Design a protein around this ligand. Structure first.
Ligand code: HEM
Ligand code: HEM
Ligand code: HEM
Ligand code: HEM
Lengths: 141, 146, 141, 146
């Protein structure tokens, strides 16, 4: 589980993203669709072209949800509940895909935060996102 | 498909004895009940809320046979699963939008079912061979994604 | 998250394994080493030849653990806690291999218990074993 | 390994900028720090207690460069990875007993490292080529396992 230092590293790094979080969400998804094309199977109704506005729009919905997880770092299972229902009952997304989203998020967080992406923080993020992904996947059956 | 002439044989000899109607239906049935997120692709099949429902649904029973039938053609094309499945890959990717990861779930359920029908005969060595076989098949069903 | 119908099916199925826990345990490991040979890397000091005394030996240990899991079904995280400390701090086993053993358990239970392996019980055990695994790979970092 | 020539260019073109001495050290170091279970493998390297301890251990940096030098061999042979790595495949299996999944993690941490150094230059499309190459390499390191 997230240790104090983990929550500390996570808040510092997320805080530097600040305003740019919406554009990171989109760079994130974009990296995902390009490197792991199977993920697209879930977005056949979106336009997945470089720059698509449906992709930026969604990018922001995703970052906004990571921000609110940081904000409630100590109560994530109840803070992300709705999202946990949506992905399990309506969208029905295979859990392996979440580890690919997370990996592209680190790549994204790493290409914009050279000063801040140390080993320890890299270890605190990986843990955060895995913990985000577990909650979101928690009600599959 | 690095299959040994002994593996190639093991598979082959045991399929011969398979009742395709029953197995196919059961694989699909179990697939939908154990990992219920697959129900997403089949909303037009009707009541798929409980195992007894999923297992009793005749559209499921019928699609199952078709699936196994395409599995059967594959065993007869073990050295080119890709060509044998190209067109199926596209359909599943381009028209149906199915995540290939389900393919693996199907192969694994598929293997469970077989050990349920043949008991003692479905030995570790036999399983081992089939595990390569279903994995060659999922990878071929997902070979033309883009 | 196990429901009560889930818990009830498990208790039953295992109950019929009754005194073959071990034979099954060993069979499962044999099925695993053979179908997923990369799992052998965790047992370089074992005599993995067929019908080896170590595999069986080890078959039981694993089985007795599952039996304790079933009996403490509502409170696994405490009943398997030591085992967790073991698999994470000492053995350090990559969490993927857990899915491979589980599948080899189901396949063994399926081949030995025709009548009890209904699709409902199949689905139950599948959640049951994955629940053991989460608990066994939870103290990792 | 479906590598298109653009993908080859992107890959080759970029790798020509890597100070392998340093990146290999960063990668191995991070692998050991973000997933400390891997440590089970290098008890002979001394202090691995904390980030700094890991990141600055000279047996780590020295090992990092040995690994990366082998990755480079690989990029000079993207058409026979399985051939390039067969002896390093046997080594890792028959003598070091290393689960291949660790190859996958290393691969991904390396993608992370590449990204860290080159910033905007690691464009989405570039990463994508890389994910294939590290996948290729991991399969090639996995092949002679038995
Ligand atoms: C950190 C992991 C993830 C988070 C925080 C996240 C969050 C969200 C959010 C906030 C929404 C918008 C909900 C709304 O409509 O009100 C959403 C929807 C959605 N997400 Fe996720 N998601 C994650 C991972 C995934 C991945 C792995 C997939 C599968 C590739 C995925 C696919 C989708 C899809 C298809 C929608 C519906 C979009 C639409 O039809 O407009 N998400 N997610
Ligand atoms: C053993 C691997 C699989 C094989 C061989 C297979 C094969 C087939 C075949 C032959 C068809 C017939 C369509 C036609 O004749 O034009 C079909 C349809 C379909 N497959 Fe699969 N499939 C497999 C796995 C999956 C699984 C894992 C999914 C996901 C749950 C899936 C989803 C579908 C859907 C939604 C259809 C169309 C159903 C309909 O028309 O109502 N398939 N498949
Ligand atoms: C289904 C979940 C699993 C359970 C319940 C389980 C159970 C056990 C038990 C009870 C022990 C004995 C510890 C003792 O000495 O008291 C053990 C040890 C061990 N386990 Fe697991 N196991 C599971 C999965 C795995 C995984 C997937 C692997 C790796 C392939 C694994 C590898 C090992 C190894 C290498 C030992 C050391 C045994 C020796 O050297 O004698 N186990 N396990
Ligand atoms: C790119 C993937 C990898 C490559 C190219 C690679 C390559 C190498 C090479 C060239 C050696 C030196 C061979 C020798 O001493 O004869 C080596 C040693 C070793 N490798 Fe890997 N390796 C990779 C990934 C891994 C990872 C993920 C692990 C496990 C964490 C690992 C474990 C080891 C160990 C334990 C040694 C011997 C350590 C020692 O010298 O005491 N390798 N590796």
């Amino acid at each position: 589980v997230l240790s104090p230092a983990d929550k500390t590293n996570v808040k510092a790094a997320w805080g530097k993203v600040g305003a740019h979080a919406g554009e990171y969400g989109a760079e994130a998804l974009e990296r995902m669709f390009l490197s792991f094309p199977t993920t697209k199977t879930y977005f056949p109704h979106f336009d997945l072209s470089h720059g698509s506005a449906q992709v930026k729009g969604h990018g922001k919905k995703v970052a906004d949800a990571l921000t609110n997880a940081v904000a409630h770092v100590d109560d994530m299972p109840n803070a992300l509940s709705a999202l946990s229902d949506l992905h399990a009952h309506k969208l029905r997304v295979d859990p392996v895909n979440f580890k690919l989203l997370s990996h592209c998020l680190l790549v994204t967080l790493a290409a914009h935060l050279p000063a801040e992406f140390t080993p320890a923080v890299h270890a605190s993020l990986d843990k955060f996102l895995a913990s985000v992904s577990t909650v979101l996947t928690s009600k599959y059956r | 498909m690095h299959l040994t002439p002994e593996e190639k044989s093991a598979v082959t000899a045991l399929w011969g004895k398979v009742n395709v109607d029953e197995v196919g239906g059961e694989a699909l049935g179990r697939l939908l009940a154990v990992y219920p997120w697959t129900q997403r692709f089949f909303e037009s099949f009707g009541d798929l809320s409980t195992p007894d429902a999923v297992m009793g649904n005749p559209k499921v029973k019928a699609h199952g046979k078709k699936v196994l039938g395409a599995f059967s053609d594959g065993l007869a094309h073990l050295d080119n699963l890709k060509g044998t499945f190209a067109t199926l890959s596209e359909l599943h990717c381009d028209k149906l939008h199915v995540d290939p990861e389900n393919f693996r779930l199907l192969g694994n359920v598929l293997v469970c079912v077989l050990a349920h029908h043949f008991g003692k005969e479905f030995t570790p060595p036999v399983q081992a061979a089939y595990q390569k076989v279903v994995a060659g098949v999922a990878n071929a069903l997902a070979h033309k994604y883009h």
